[PDB]
Design a protein around this motif. Structure first.
Motif, mmCIF file in Angstrom:
data_model
loop_
_atom_site.group_PDB
_atom_site.id
_atom_site.type_symbol
_atom_site.label_atom_id
_atom_site.label_comp_id
_atom_site.label_asym_id
_atom_site.label_seq_id
_atom_site.Cartn_x
_atom_site.Cartn_y
_atom_site.Cartn_z
ATOM 1 N N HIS A 1 15.513 15.338 -11.257
ATOM 2 C CA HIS A 1 15.481 16.730 -11.678
ATOM 3 C C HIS A 1 14.044 17.215 -11.722
ATOM 4 N N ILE B 1 12.424 20.485 -13.992
ATOM 5 C CA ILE B 1 12.797 21.457 -15.016
ATOM 6 C C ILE B 1 11.639 22.433 -15.183
ATOM 7 N N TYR C 1 12.993 11.346 -23.788
ATOM 8 C CA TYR C 1 14.256 11.126 -23.092
ATOM 9 C C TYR C 1 15.225 10.503 -24.087
ATOM 10 N N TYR D 1 16.510 20.200 -23.576
ATOM 11 C CA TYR D 1 17.236 20.358 -22.323
ATOM 12 C C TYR D 1 18.457 19.450 -22.254
ATOM 13 N N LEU E 1 20.792 17.568 -19.689
ATOM 14 C CA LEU E 1 20.779 17.121 -18.298
ATOM 15 C C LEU E 1 22.165 17.035 -17.663
ATOM 16 N N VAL F 1 20.356 22.208 -15.061
ATOM 17 C CA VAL F 1 19.859 21.712 -16.338
ATOM 18 C C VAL F 1 19.269 22.874 -17.125
#
Ligand SMILES: O=C(O)c1cccnc1
Lengths: 297, 231, 56, 338, 208
Positions: free
Chosen positions: D89, D91, D103, D122, D124, D131
């Motif tokens: 990803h 972002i 994370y 966020y 995921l 996202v």
């Protein structure tokens, strides 16, 4: 010291007495002055510096072209000591003529490109050219090498050495009537790069002047160095091109039917051709005397 | 909520042509790679075409290359030319997105009925139907001609459930992982070349046809389908 | 201001001072015991071979 | 009145010092003298995660040791598949001035924050495929320096208003707030069992907090200058902190005092992260001097050097299975060492 | 590679979007904006229009100026000021109608991250300073001032007292005196930035 028939044309060459007495000393001086500066410049560019921008890419290419030019010189020292009895034979002769011509052409190209780079960096500072990536500079560099190589690759195709009397000549600059492209190359590689060099230098100087920041000491540094690069280019190349012009003037007005006219001016040609090597020996001007990094190292 | 709706069905003259369109809403369509899948009028699923994100790559089944064309404003198209008698089917528009931990084939449009007037990995499901009743536990098995357990460690078998009158739902992906929103009663099993879905404490909601599928390489192969049928 | 703030500070210092403290000999020795017990499960101090290493 | 409170606080500190000095029967360096040294720890740059365009300020590993999130002042937080160097990803942050990211242990979420004072959560695994911000946590009076998940529903943040706080990510509100430093709470780390955590502050103290009782349980000091980074020893009974005083220290929870000190005369740059290996036997410290050094955490001598960056390392992190140690620096390249 | 090539396609696509965003953003010029409390910052921000950091931005002669007012931070500078190491110039505002600003300038203009980064110095409220000097002498703010109490000299003395504080020799302090009604501030910022950019290019060329 008499005459020749070659390339289906009348040519002439002269093993005059003065050449071994002056040229090998001067050329050896160019060889040591060139290697001691330029090799250390490559050393600095490889280990002392640690990152690149397009400017530094072109400066590195300039140093490389000068390095190969300098690497030519010792053979030629021997060649002039041997009075143009070229010992090393066919393949060395062809590759040496090729390289040496290509190295003048290429060092001239990177002088020109460094000047254009400075122009766009100072006269049009926001322009996109000033923000190109190192990969972009690398592909531009390989194309520049491409033209400098291909425009003179024929010197590998032409036959050499040329044999007469007690000698076997490994040379391109014999006098004669056929204007093979090598002469056009040697003339335009001065005049067109001179045009670009002087235009770019003049506009950089003017833009720093009219901006009224010419007052600062380091801007005075920049101004003076911009001008000395151009003056070095002129003094290194102009005396040789004017002598080639005189050779063609004498050939136009008087021909080869009395070649003893040409002896001293041919000696002078090779004497001044050593200047074109001086442009390589005087390369420290482009990397040491400016910048903070080189006085720091 | 996520939604896919297709249009352009009905009768067509054989040898003719038709464009079928898929309209996508509720999700970031540009980032997905979209498939087309077709079901013959009384038979198991068969794969038709694929088009990736940004239209970088496109693939077609062996009986379709060059006769159809896939293209993709949140709309996807299948352009069909020289429709044969065999090309009648319900066509499903199927989304998929690929990255570590992603779940391909996870949502299937409702589908349009269209009708008309050897190196590939073969796959078999050993039983055509299984009689079963709620509260029991059942097993459905699947095999492939080439091993699916790839060098990077994944084994690319996918399992789908088609309840009668619905577009299929993804149940298991890469032979073990359970798809989001699926009840925990389901589980994948097996490795290498033979695979098995296990249903513990079956319910009437689990009655339907189960298809296994390989995704190791194109063209994608669906199994013949096993009907877990009530009593 | 300052009376309440200093009251909070001294309350904290006194409440914290009461904590029980073990001898550094023990408190260091069992760190050594941990390190030596799990030296067999640490790929960074004993180099992992390329057949087992995922970052080939 | 006030003078009596000041004097009593002073006497409380002298009792602290007396008790701590009484427990120092022997030093770690003296006890572990007979242990064999870990030797020359050679390591090589197995991967280079090219793709950030400005200084990287944070990194964090997924609990699976394969996915990593790295965030930079270009305004992107990117999730990397470390085994293949693919970008999973990217972002776009609502503001470019990030200073931290994390994370979640489940892998469902990524959190981020910085000079905005706001901390963004966020999601995921959205059904829509993209996202998106599930929650923007607001309330600090200064930049958020560092944050960590306890579990998907609650995250702890550390900030330049002398305060750490524990958030309920569902409501978006501070379930508990931890006042008590004299300066910025520059860095933080939750313990292995997440029952308690430590924070290193710009007043050169590091404090031990209880996330259920909401109170400071112990206070550790000994640096001359701000503590830029901190983390627990994997057993959870010790932690180690790295100062702008160009040294790292190992503190013991039960002995309430510093056990060992990691320094060398040729080192003058400040630490920017200090992280243990899975056995605890190695402590890897990132320095402003562009270098990173690996210390034998028992013998307290240099095991080796992870030198690969053209600018200071801003972050470092060992995978949960110990299989690699990432670093990330201001020259915008993350690099995996093993 | 199986369905591990579609993942690689996604990888390349978002690498493309990263670069495309980056090359578009590199066209912008970043300017940290500073000053003591209430030192007129907001007025030049207002002339150009448009609890954390406060980014203003404006566009002029094809440059996009991003203009960070950072003063909302209620915390010591040292632990976040290294974010702004990459700005093109620092814009520093002083209210002549006000001296803490002078210590702040002394502190920042010699900061280890900014010894190579130039300062643009706006002496705001020149008109009110002309009024002040007419009623109360400059010696009140500078007891060592040794000269006539007239605008054209007192103001230049303040300018000198600021410019005297930079101790590194790699920077210049581009001064200006603003009457707070001027629309010219964008041009002042712009051509100061052009001087700064060509000086940076001359350094990058090794010609300086
Ligand atoms: O410099 C040259 O190109 C050269 C030198 C000697 C002979 N011919 C050419």
């Amino acid at each position: 010291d008499h005459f020749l028939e070659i390339d289906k044309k009348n040519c002439c060459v002269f093993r005059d007495d003065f050449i071994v007495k002056v040229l090998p000393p001067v050329l050896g001086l160019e060889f040591i002055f060139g290697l001691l500066g330029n090799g250390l410049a490559l050393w600095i560019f490889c280990f002392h510096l640690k990152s690149w921008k397009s400017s530094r890419i072109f400066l590195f290419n300039l140093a490389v072209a000068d390095f190969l030019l300098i690497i030519c010189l010792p053979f030629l020292m021997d060649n002039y000591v041997r009075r143009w009895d070229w010992k090393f034979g066919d393949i060395p002769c062809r590759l040496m003529l090729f390289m040496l011509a290509m190295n003048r052409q290429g060092s001239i190209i990177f002088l020109t490109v460094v000047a254009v780079d400075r122009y766009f960096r100072v006269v049009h500072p926001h322009h996109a050219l000033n923000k190109i990536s190192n990969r972009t500079a690398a592909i531009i560099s390989c194309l520049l090498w491409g033209i400098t190589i291909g425009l003179t690759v024929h010197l590998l195709k032409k036959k050499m050495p040329i044999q007469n009397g007690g000698a076997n000549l490994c040379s391109s600059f014999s006098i004669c009537h056929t204007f093979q492209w090598h002469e056009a190359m040697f003339l335009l590689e001065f005049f067109l790069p001179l045009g670009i060099i002087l235009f770019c230098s003049a506009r950089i100087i003017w833009s720093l002047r009219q901006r009224q920041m010419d007052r600062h000491a380091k801007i005075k540094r920049a101004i003076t160095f911009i001008m000395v690069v151009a003056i070095v280019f002129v003094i290194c190349f102009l005396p040789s091109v004017v002598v080639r012009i005189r050779i063609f003037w004498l050939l136009h007005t008087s021909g080869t039917q009395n070649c003893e006219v040409y002896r001293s001016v041919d000696l002078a040609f090779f004497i001044t051709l050593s200047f074109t090597y001086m442009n390589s020996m005087l390369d420290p001007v482009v990397y040491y005397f400016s910048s903070p990094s080189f006085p720091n190292f | 909520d996520v939604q896919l709706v297709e249009s352009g069905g009905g009768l067509v003259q054989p040898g003719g042509s038709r464009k079928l369109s898929c309209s996508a809403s509720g999700f970031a369509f540009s980032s997905f790679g979209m498939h087309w899948v077709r079901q013959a009028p009384e038979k198991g699923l068969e794969w038709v075409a694929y088009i990736s994100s940004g239209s970088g790559t496109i693939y077609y089944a062996d009986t379709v290359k060059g006769r159809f064309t896939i293209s993709r404003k949140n709309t996807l198209f299948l352009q069909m030319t020289s429709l044969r008698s065999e090309d009648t089917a319900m066509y499903y528009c199927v989304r998929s997105i690929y990255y570590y931990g992603s779940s391909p084939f996870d949502f299937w449009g409702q589908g349009t009925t269209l009708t008309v007037s050897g190196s590939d990995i073969v796959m078999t499901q050993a039983t055509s139907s299984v009689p079963v009743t709620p509260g029991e536990s059942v097993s459905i098995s699947c095999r492939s001609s080439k091993s699916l357990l790839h060098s990077n460690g994944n084994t690319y078998l996918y399992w789908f459930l088609q309840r009668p009158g619905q577009s299929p739902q993804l149940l298991i992906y890469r032979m073990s992982n359970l798809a989001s929103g699926v009840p925990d009663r389901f589980s994948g099993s097996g490795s290498g070349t033979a695979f098995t879905l296990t249903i513990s404490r079956l319910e009437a909601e689990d009655v339907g046809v189960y298809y296994c599928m390989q995704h190791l390489e194109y063209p994608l192969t669906f199994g013949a389908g096993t009907k877990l049928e009530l009593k | 201001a300052s009376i309440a703030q200093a009251r909070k500070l001294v309350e904290q210092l006194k409440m914290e001072a009461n904590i029980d403290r073990i001898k550094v000999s023990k408190a260091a020795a069992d760190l050594m015991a941990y390190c030596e017990a799990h030296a067999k499960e640490d790929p960074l101090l004993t180099p992992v071979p390329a057949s087992e290493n995922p970052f080939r | 009145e006030l003078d009596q409170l000041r004097q009593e606080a002073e006497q409380l500190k002298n009792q602290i010092r007396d008790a701590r000095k009484a427990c120092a029967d022997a030093t770690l360096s003296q006890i572990t003298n007979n242990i064999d040294p870990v030797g020359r720890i050679q390591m090589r740059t197995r991967r280079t995660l090219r793709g950030h365009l400005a200084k990287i300020y944070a990194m964090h590993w997924g609990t699976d040791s394969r996915l990593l999130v790295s965030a930079s002042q270009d305004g992107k937080l990117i999730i990397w598949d470390s085994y293949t160097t693919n970008k999973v990803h990217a972002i776009p942050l609502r503001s470019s001035w990030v200073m931290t990211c994390a994370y979640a242990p489940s892998g469902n979420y990524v959190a981020c924050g910085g000079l905005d004072n706001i901390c963004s959560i966020y999601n995921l695994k959205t059904r829509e495929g993209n996202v998106r911000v599930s929650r923007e946590l607001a309330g600090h009076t200064g930049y958020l320096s560092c944050c960590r998940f306890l579990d998907d529903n609650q995250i702890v943040t550390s900030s330049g208003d002398t305060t750490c706080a524990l958030w309920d990510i569902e409501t978006g509100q501070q379930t508990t707030t931890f006042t008590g430093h004299t300066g910025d709470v520059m860095s933080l780390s939750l313990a292995p069992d997440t029952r308690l955590f430590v924070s290193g502050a710009c007043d050169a103290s590091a404090k031990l907090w209880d996330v259920r009782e909401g109170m400071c349980r112990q206070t550790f000091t000994g640096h001359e200058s701000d503590i830029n980074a901190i983390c627990f020893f994997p057993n959870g009974n010790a932690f180690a902190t790295g100062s702008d005083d160009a040294t790292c220290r190992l503190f013991d929870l039960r002995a309430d005092q510093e056990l060992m000190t990691y320094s060398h005369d040729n080192i003058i740059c400040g630490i920017t992260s200090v992280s243990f290996s899975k056995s605890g036997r190695l402590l890897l410290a990132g320095y402003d001097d562009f270098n990173c050094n690996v210390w034998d955490a028992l013998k307290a001598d240099r095991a080796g050097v992870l030198a690969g960056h053209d600018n200071r390392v801003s972050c470092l992190g060992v995978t949960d299975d110990g299989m690699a140690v990432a670093t990330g620096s201001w020259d915008s390249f993350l690099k995996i060492w093993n | 590679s199986a369905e591990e090539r579609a993942a690689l396609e996604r990888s390349k696509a978002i690498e493309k979007n990263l670069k495309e965003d980056g090359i578009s953003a590199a066209k912008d010029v970043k300017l940290l904006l500073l000053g003591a409390d209430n030192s007129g910052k907001s007025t030049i921000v207002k002339q150009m229009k448009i609890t954390g950091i406060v980014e203003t931005h404006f566009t002029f002669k094809n440059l996009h100026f991003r203009l960070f007012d950072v003063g909302g931070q209620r915390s010591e500078r040292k632990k976040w000021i290294h974010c702004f190491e990459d700005v093109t110039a620092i814009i520093f505002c002083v209210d002549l109608s006000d001296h803490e600003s002078l210590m702040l300038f002394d502190s920042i203009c010699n900061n280890k991250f900014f010894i190579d980064t130039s300062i643009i110095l706006f002496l705001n409220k020149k008109d009110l300073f002309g009024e002040k000097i007419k009623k109360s002498p400059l010696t009140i703010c500078f007891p060592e001032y040794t000269g006539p109490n007239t605008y054209e000299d007192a103001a230049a003395y303040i300018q000198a007292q600021f410019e005297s504080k930079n101790r590194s020799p790699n920077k210049e302090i581009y001064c200006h005196m603003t009457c707070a009604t001027d629309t010219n501030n964008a041009q002042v910022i712009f051509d100061a930035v052009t001087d700064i950019i060509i000086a940076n290019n001359l350094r990058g060329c090794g010609l300086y």
